[PDB]
Amino acid sequence: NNIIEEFDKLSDDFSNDINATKQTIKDLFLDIEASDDVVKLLSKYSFVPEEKLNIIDGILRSFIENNKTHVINSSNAYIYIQKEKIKNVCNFILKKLNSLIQINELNKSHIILKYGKGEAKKGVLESIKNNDDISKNLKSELLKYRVSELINFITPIYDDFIKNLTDLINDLQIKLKNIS
DSSP states (O other): OTHHHHHHHHHHHHHHHHHHHHHHHHHHHHHHTOOOHHHHHHHHHTHHHHHHHHHHHHHHHHHHHHHHHHHHTSOHHHHHHHHHHHHHHHHHHHHHHHHHHHHHHHHHHHHHHHTOOOSSTTTTHHHHHHOSSSOHHHHHHHTTOOHHHHHHHHHHHHHHHHHHHHHHHHHHHHHHHTTO
């Protein structure tokens, strides 16, 4: 009976984590928007990743609700094991998302360096200078650092980001089906 409450907890926790991720990515975009014409463009760009995360959040919540039915008349084994499986899927999604966040953190820094000029926000140069996680090659190429050009630069990066979010949604729908 409280089992339904526990599944509800799965949904709610997942929603919280997803909203946190959403805020992180929004912070990426906001940090990039420093720096009136390109700003509106980036703010437009920032709406699609939020939509993708709202999909992931909603797909999981929809799955759990429709799976409550199977939980009431099944063995305790199925309940505990299934709960475990759902937790695993959620953790998978969150791990992939966090990896994606790291990737686009480096992408953000790259964008700020190549175009934007804080230069207080372009104190990314010190973070790049101290970054021991990137190759010295990339470091070298980066420390050397109008609109149609910016579009030309961020279009592959942004399209790849949304593509990764789109395939992640596909992975989620596949993994949920395997336990559906």
